[PDB]
């Protein structure tokens, strides 16, 4: 179990993540101070939707302010790539030197990493964010369509390997099948292979159910925007 | 799609079902009456919790007074055997004895009928109860355990062969990976070999999700005391 400001990750009911969105700075600060009285146990800033993502100082004094508002909610940061449904198109070089920015002079509690990026580069910054107190979020997306169970098991697993402190994977169900195929995956990675915490997810209208089904079949968190309210409530009905 | 009273069971959302299982006539016709304000599609009538189920003529004309108040909802009346979850012993002689009496002068919309009672006996009742309008449910209840996804799929497969207007099957998940094997013998007879609406249920707590996931997977009805009134939002919640 990941234990992130007294949050434990890994144990009980699934942990509600809240994402932030917005492009400007200004409302990335409301929504922040908004999270201190959402139904949510941490907060997502997703930073590809900045608007100033490049100027890296920017993001690292703006994560501070983000930080100072959080009513002590662990913080994720996020660069989602554009092959795996992210904002905007960015090198890898940029890449990996905005992380390492915010590793050494932002503010942050989980970092997310692409388990498909660069691995050499990857890795060294997975040990230089660990040596900051970072917990590291590795993580895969496929917005197209969903993998067999074993590849997704496979994926899993392999985050795993490259020491991963929480191993995440979203995938896109094409009809009621993939849905399975996504929480079989999930329980079989779970029961079977795991020794750190995963999260995974059906995406869309078709999946939705995998949203509320963590405790069931072992995905530690859920992200929340259905709604964060609605979904406390719906853990709480579903709950072992 | 089986069409009862406007109820199109196996089209749209998953049609709800409230059971009555008070002991009493006076409370049967209590929750009767109660069902007509209540968020539900129709009403079983549980006979195997009646104090009089013995009675035959008795049954016949409560069940009578009972279809008076439904407010033109669907009965479906359900004799459960104590091998599958009953209330109470009783030989197999009154059990046909007492559906062929409410068969020709009892009210009802659907009749319930176990696939492992005496074929050739259940045979000769399915064709009587057609002959007076009644549907068909043939079922299958194991409360201890969870067959495999295939004897799942072959029990649903022998309902339909067996004339069944609507196939049901509930099990007993002892661990999460039975209630995905509940789910998915459903999704695989829904596409593969269904040609009647089947009703499936992975029960207690663990298989909750199974009560609310019927559009996804192919179960056509679901049974609320989950309430009535949260199953109903539930089901709007995850429609596809």
Same mark, same amino acid.
């Given at each position: 179990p990941v234990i992130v400001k007294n949050v434990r990750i890994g144990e009980g009911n699934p942990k509600?993540?809240?994402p932030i969105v917005a492009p400007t700075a200004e409302d990335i600060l409301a929504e922040a101070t908004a999270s201190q009285t959402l139904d949510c146990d941490l907060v997502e800033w997703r930073l590809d939707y900045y608007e100033n993502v490049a100027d890296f100082?920017?993001?690292?004094?703006?994560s501070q302010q983000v930080m100072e508002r959080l009513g002590q909610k662990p913080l994720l940061l996020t660069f989602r790539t554009q092959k795996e449904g992210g904002e905007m198109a960015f090198? =890898? !070089?940029?890449?990996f030197a905005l992380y390492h920015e915010l590793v050494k002079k932002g503010a942050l509690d989980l970092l997310?990493?692409?388990?498909?990026?660069?691995?050499?580069?990857a890795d060294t910054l997975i040990h230089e964010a660990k040596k900051a107190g970072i917990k590291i979020v590795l993580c895969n997306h496929d917005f197209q369509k969903?993998?067999?169970? =074993? !590849?997704?098991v496979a994926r899993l697993r392999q985050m795993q390997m490259r020491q991963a402190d929480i191993c995440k994977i979203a995938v896109?169900?094409?009809?009621?099948?993939?849905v399975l195929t996504l929480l079989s995956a999930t329980n079989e990675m779970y029961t079977h292979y795991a020794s750190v915490p995963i999260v995974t997810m059906s995406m869309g209208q078709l999946g939705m159910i995998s949203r509320v089904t963590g405790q069931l079949f072992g995905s530690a968190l859920t992200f929340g925007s259905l709604s964060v309210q609605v979904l406390r409530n719906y853990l709480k009905t579903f709950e072992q």
């Open positions: 509600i993540v809240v100082s920017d993001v690292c004094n703006l090198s =890898e !070089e940029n890449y997310d990493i692409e388990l498909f990026a660069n691995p050499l580069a969903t993998p067999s169970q =074993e !590849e997704i896109m169900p094409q009809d009621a099948t993939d």
